[PDB]
Nucleic acid binder design. Structure first.
Ligand SMILES: [Mg+2]
Ligand SMILES: [Mg+2]
Ligand SMILES: [Mg+2]
Ligand SMILES: [Mg+2]
Ligand SMILES: [Mg+2]
Ligand SMILES: [Mg+2]
Ligand SMILES: [Mg+2]
Ligand SMILES: [Mg+2]
Ligand SMILES: [Mg+2]
Ligand SMILES: [Mg+2]
Ligand SMILES: [Mg+2]
Ligand SMILES: [Mg+2]
Ligand SMILES: [Mg+2]
Ligand SMILES: [Mg+2]
Ligand SMILES: [Mg+2]
Ligand SMILES: [Mg+2]
Ligand SMILES: [Mg+2]
Ligand SMILES: [Mg+2]
Ligand SMILES: [Mg+2]
Ligand SMILES: [Mg+2]
Ligand SMILES: [Mg+2]
Ligand SMILES: [Mg+2]
Ligand SMILES: [Mg+2]
Lengths: 271, 117, 51, 100, 55, 88
RNA sequence: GUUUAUUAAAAACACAGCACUGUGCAAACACGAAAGUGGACGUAUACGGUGUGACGCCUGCCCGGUGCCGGAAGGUUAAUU
RNA sequence: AGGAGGUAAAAUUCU
RNA sequence: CUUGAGUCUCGUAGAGGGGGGUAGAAUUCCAGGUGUAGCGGUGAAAUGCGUAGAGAUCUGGAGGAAUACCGGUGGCGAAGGCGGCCCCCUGGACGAAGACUGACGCUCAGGUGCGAAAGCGUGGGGAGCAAACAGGAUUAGAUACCCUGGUAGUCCACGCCGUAAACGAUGUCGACUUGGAGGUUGUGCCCUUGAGGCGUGGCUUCCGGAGCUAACGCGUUAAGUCGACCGCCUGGGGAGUAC
């Protein structure tokens, strides 16, 4: 559900909420979460390594199962929960032995849906197999890069990879980054698309929306003086410079990939 | 080359410049020679005669690899449709079979609007 | 379309050459659009093809 | 209860999943008191044209009377079974019993 | 007709290029010339007879 | 137009015997009965404009002949609408 | 909303929103002769960079110059031999 | 004796 | 009161409308195989495409849009308009016997709703085609017609818009007046005695009498003969404009 909220006040006027009515109202499952302290975007050194980061709400880490290593054992979707730590939504599952876990909720499921994992383990949304066991063309999320190394690929809300070949011992797959890229095929993956793909329909609507999301004012390079940034000073709104990061490198066009150790896995790269 | 003797000639009569190639049974390929840059170029191609001679220069280079026959499927409307085969069976290839391959939709894609000369 | 015909001669054969298709259905499908004038083609190709 | 004529077909290298089907459909239409009035089966049969580049494939038939249902949750059982390759369910027009 | 599986017949209503045949040639009844099409065309869908004649 | 079986039921109580199929009571009853079930059809689909056009005839006609009797045999109406549902 | 603590609170900066661009994760990028660390216990509905600055109607022509993204036939060319 | 397909390019004006 | 009108019964044909499903041919593109200097295009050209290999050809795989043949002075809808196949929901028309109803009618200013294409919003989609835009020609000029490209859009969803030579340029209903060829869809009776013999319904195309008409033409589907009710015109412009 997306809502537009009326212009009761500016910066409500442009707001647009994503309201999920079967997201469990209340407190998440205690034993599956641990503390998670903010950074400011400052590294062990103390300096700002990444900027725009800091301030905004408290946020307890939910430990989601990115591996789905326990094969066999059915598990049942007890409830869907809100997750601060990511756009995606999670699902508190109950394995029939009594174990409990969190999993990246896919487009499909709801309460009571059964799910499981393993070299067979059905083949519906919510179920995880090695890709050496998923049909080509099949639509998947939470893909592994190295087997046993948990999911890394296509995890964001409403995101997905489709497998698209098999080529032997790898298995070429295309990520709606646009890139097709071979990968060892014992690498697992969960059936379905992930999360509320509605995510991107939000609008935020005011400044503070962003502040309590963690993010912080971005100051232009021309708003500054020439000692602060290469977009120089001015004397009344001026430029005449080849756009560039504060540290001197071109922005716009300047390809900056370097990793030949993996260039053996890219096959067609985004456009 | 390696000499089969059994092959096929794929002929494309687009109209405006009309062309012919030859291949093997499962459809590999070995020889164009074609009306365009080959005995004029311009309105004096797209003539049946030019298809004749377009078949000849094909012939005069599509030998070797055996060939002493060929299946002959044909793509096009207009000049060069027949006159090639007419010169093919005259150069002494046993005209095994002929075929239509001109693509006909079950009206599928829009074609291009407004053209009065 | 696919023609094989039997035995001794060379003649490309067929006074049934314009068999089912080519020349004609290629003009139509080729030229361009229509929609209103196949209706005029209609009440002419059988406003005349009465007697 | 109105009649339907059914005529699915499953690929060669699993013809012999033959009767495994039919029965559960009888359990599915006897369970909705609807006599089928003629069955047929005719496996090995070649095709007018290849499909997925494959000649030949197993066939069947029916003319079942049944509820305006099951065909709901049956016409959709041809929407799994990557096994089966094609289908068609037909009008009705009274009962059926001879042709072949 | 009363049947479409009549691939038996039909073949006397469709040319050696795979084309349905004009009702002006075959000279068939109107009401039953349709009943032929919704039944010949039915049957080319599950490949007992082809659409084309080249593949 | 509902089931050929259906309406068999509704001619009773409304009518003095079966095959008394023409008392203004029944058609009204036949109409409403369809309409009501038929509002389901326009829940789903709903952009089915044409089908609706037929509906309103039922509604127009129903109302038109529900007005006819208002002139003849008073309270031969006030003994059927509440018997059915509709006076909004 | 912010700002010249101590002569400038503004039309300046920020803003939500828009676009361009870079990044397949040992991400780009940043702090670090390094180890390591942030980015992020995030994974392209993400993250960084640059410009624009709710919204509405809109955003034309110009790739010669300078940049950036592609190229290969050559011409010219480093250490080296 | 039917159908088919191809045959004229641009070229203003006159109290 | 039953004959105008409606209801019930068993059926008929239909591209009537809405939803979901699936097939088959082609265009484009992606990956390869072979293959060599041309392809494409026009009036003629050139722009463009090709020596990293095009066009041609083969195999394989994407994706979108449209349904050749049936197809036809064919059907269907109130109009706009609707064409592959498949099931689900649903509208109307028509036929036949009999049953019920008993004038329940016709028309309709206001009012309501439907309404091609282009167009607008939000997003999604994008193979072809193609406003705009660009380049090639053409020309005195060429903001064109022609050629290489090409975005909006054309496709979907939901909400707008409400206009067309939206035309048969012919308002709706009913009744009444010679005919000929048909087309198409029913149904009653009579050696299935034919793919019938003899009738009787609804729609429909061409020709045509009387009559009408300014003439063209209309002519049982009227523009003939009548009657109910509605809408509209009062010289060209100004103007379907201003307020
Ligand atoms: Mg910003
Ligand atoms: Mg910025
Ligand atoms: Mg400054
Ligand atoms: Mg500096
Ligand atoms: Mg200045
Ligand atoms: Mg203030
Ligand atoms: Mg101060
Ligand atoms: Mg940003
Ligand atoms: Mg500014
Ligand atoms: Mg003149
Ligand atoms: Mg002058
Ligand atoms: Mg292909
Ligand atoms: Mg496809
Ligand atoms: Mg019906
Ligand atoms: Mg409307
Ligand atoms: Mg439109
Ligand atoms: Mg739009
Ligand atoms: Mg008007
Ligand atoms: Mg019209
Ligand atoms: Mg006349
Ligand atoms: Mg008459
Ligand atoms: Mg009149
Ligand atoms: Mg006006």
């Amino acid at each position: 559900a997306v809502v537009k909220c009326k212009p009761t006040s500016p910066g409500r006027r442009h707001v647009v909420k994503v309201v999920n009515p079967e997201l469990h109202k209340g407190k998440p499952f205690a034993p599956l979460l641990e503390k998670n302290s903010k950074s400011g975007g400052r590294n062990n050194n103390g300096r700002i390594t990444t900027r725009h980061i800091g301030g905004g709400h408290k946020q307890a880490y939910r430990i989601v199962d990115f591996k789905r290593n326990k094969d066999g054992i059915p598990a049942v979707v007890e409830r869907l929960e809100y997750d601060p730590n990511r756009s995606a939504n999670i699902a508190l599952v109950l394995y029939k032995d009594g174990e409990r876990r969190y999993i990246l909720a896919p487009k499909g499921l709801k309460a009571g849906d059964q799910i499981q994992s393993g070299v067979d383990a059905a083949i519906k949304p919510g179920n995880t197999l090695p890709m050496r066991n998923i049909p080509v063309g099949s639509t998947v999320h939470n893909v592994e890069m190295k087997p046993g190394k948990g999911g890394q690929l296509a995890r964001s809300a409403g995101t997905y990879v489709q497998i698209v070949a098999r080529d032997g011992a790898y298995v070429t797959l295309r990520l709606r980054s646009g890139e097709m890229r071979k990968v060892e095929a014992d690498c697992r993956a969960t059936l379905g698309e992930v999360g509320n793909a509605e995510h991107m329909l939000r609008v935020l609507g005011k400044a503070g929306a962003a502040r309590w999301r963690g993010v912080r004012p971005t100051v232009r390079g021309t708003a500054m003086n020439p000692v602060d940034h290469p977009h120089g000073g001015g004397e009344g709104r001026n430029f005449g410079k080849h756009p560039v990061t504060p540290w001197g490198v071109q922005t716009k066009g300047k390809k900056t990939r370097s990793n030949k150790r993996t260039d053996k896995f890219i096959v067609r790269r985004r456009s | 080359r390696k000499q089969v003797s059994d092959g096929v000639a794929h002929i494309h009569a687009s109209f405006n410049n009309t062309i012919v190639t030859i291949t093997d049974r499962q459809g590999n390929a070995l020889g164009w020679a074609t009306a365009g840059g080959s005995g004029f170029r311009g309105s004096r191609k797209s003539t049946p005669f030019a298809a004749q001679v377009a078949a000849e220069r094909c012939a005069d280079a599509v030998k070797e690899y055996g060939i002493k026959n060929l299946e002959v499927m044909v793509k096009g409307p207009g000049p060069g449709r027949e006159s090639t085969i007419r010169a093919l069976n005259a150069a002494g290839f046993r005209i095994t079979n002929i075929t239509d391959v001109t693509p006909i939709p079950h009206n599928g894609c829009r074609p291009p609007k407004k053209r009065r000369v | 379309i696919k023609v094989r015909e039997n035995e001794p001669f060379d003649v490309a054969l067929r006074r049934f050459k314009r068999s089912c298709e080519k020349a004609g259905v290629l003009a139509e499908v080729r030229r361009r659009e229509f929609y209103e004038k196949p209706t005029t083609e209609r009440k002419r190709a059988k406003a005349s093809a009465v007697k | 209860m109105r009649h339907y004529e059914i005529v699915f077909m499953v690929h060669p290298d699993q013809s012999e999943q033959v009767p495994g089907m039919i029965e559960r459909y009888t359990a599915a239409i006897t369970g909705a008191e609807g006599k089928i009035h003629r069955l047929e089966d005719w496996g090995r049969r070649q095709l007018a044209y290849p499909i997925n580049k494959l000649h030949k494939a197993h066939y069947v038939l029916m003319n079942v009377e049944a509820p305006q249902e099951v065909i709901d949750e049956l016409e959709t059982t041809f929407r799994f079974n990557d096994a089966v390759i094609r289908s068609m369910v037909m009008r009705t027009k009274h009962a059926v019993t001879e042709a072949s | 007709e009363i049947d479409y599986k009549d691939i038996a017949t039909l073949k006397n209503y469709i040319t050696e290029s795979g084309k349905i045949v004009p009702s002006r040639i075959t000279g068939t009844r109107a009401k039953y010339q349709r009943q032929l099409a919704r039944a010949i065309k039915r049957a080319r869908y599950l490949s007992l007879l082809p659409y084309t004649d080249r593949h | 137009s509902l089931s050929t079986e259906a309406t068999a039921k509704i001619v009773s109580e409304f009518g003095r015997d079966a095959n008394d199929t023409g008392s203004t009571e029944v058609q009204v009853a036949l109409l409403t009965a369809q309409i009501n079930h038929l509002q389901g059809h326009f829940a789903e689909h709903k952009k089915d404009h044409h089908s609706r056009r037929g509906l309103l005839r039922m509604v127009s006609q129903r109302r038109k002949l529900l007005d006819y009797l208002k002139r003849k045999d008073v309270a031969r109406y006030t003994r059927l609408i509440e018997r059915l549902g509709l006076r909004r």
